[PDB]
Amino acid sequence: EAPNEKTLRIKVSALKRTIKDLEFAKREVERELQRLDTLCQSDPDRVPQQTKVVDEAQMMVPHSVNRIMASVKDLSDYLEKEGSTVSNEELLDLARATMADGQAAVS
């Protein structure tokens, strides 16, 4: 209920969501590339539309990466400021674990 604890929790949850976003976005690229091939053979009048969706799917990967990194920096900055005094050891461990998961997810 400490306001710094509450803010830290929100930032950790936000970061976790950006990481899951990238995972689903990467899985979807592979599907869009398949969805292209399917619609290619079944219905090539849809291929132009799906070519454009595939290209956008691929660009959504760096977009998702950029969001993870912006969230990692925000959390990291907070931990140097009002987050620096949080006494909840397990929340601090979780914040550090989640940052490490984000860094792993990019790279």
Numbering used by the authors: 19 to 125
Passage from the reporting paper:
Tubulin-binding cofactor A (TBCA) participates in microtubule formation, a key process in eukaryotic biology to create the cytoskeleton. Tubulin-binding cofactor (TBC) proteins, of which there are at least five, are intimately involved in this assembly process, but the details about specific contributions are limited. In order to underpin dissection of TBC function and delineation of structure–activity relationships, we have instigated studies of the trypanosomatid proteins and now report a crystallographic study of one, TBCA, from Leishmania major. This protein is thought to make an early contribution to the assembly process through delivery of β-tubulin onto a second protein, TBCD. In one model for microtubule biogenesis this TBCD–β-tubulin complex then facilitates α/β-tubulin heterodimer formation.
The structure of LmTBCA was determined by the SAD approach and was refined to 1.9 Å resolution. There was no reliable electron density for the first 18 residues and the model comprises residues Glu19–Ser125. The protein fold consists of three α-helices (α1–α3) aligned in an antiparallel fashion. Helices α1 and α2, each comprising ten helical turns, are distorted, with bends of approximately 20–25°, giving the molecule an overall curved appearance. The proline at position 80 in LmTBCA is strictly conserved in these structures and appears to contribute to a bend in α2 in all cases, although the effect appears most pronounced in the Leishmania protein. Although LmTBCA did display a dimeric assembly, it is distinct from that observed for ScRbl2p and is driven by the formation of a disulfide linkage. However, the formation of this Cys58–Cys58 disulfide bond may have stabilized the structure of the α1–α2 loop, and as Cys58 is not a conserved residue in TBCA sequences, it may have fortuitously aided in the crystallization of LmTBCA. We do not ascribe any biological significance to the observation of a covalent dimer of LmTBCA formed owing to a disulfide linkage. The concave surface of LmTBCA might therefore present a favourable site for interaction, driven by electrostatic attraction, with β-tubulin. The presence of a localized region enriched in basic residues, which are conserved in TBCA from evolutionarily diverse species, together with the overall acidic properties of the C-terminal tails of β-tubulins, hints that electrostatic forces might be relevant for complex formation, but further work is required to address such a hypothesis.
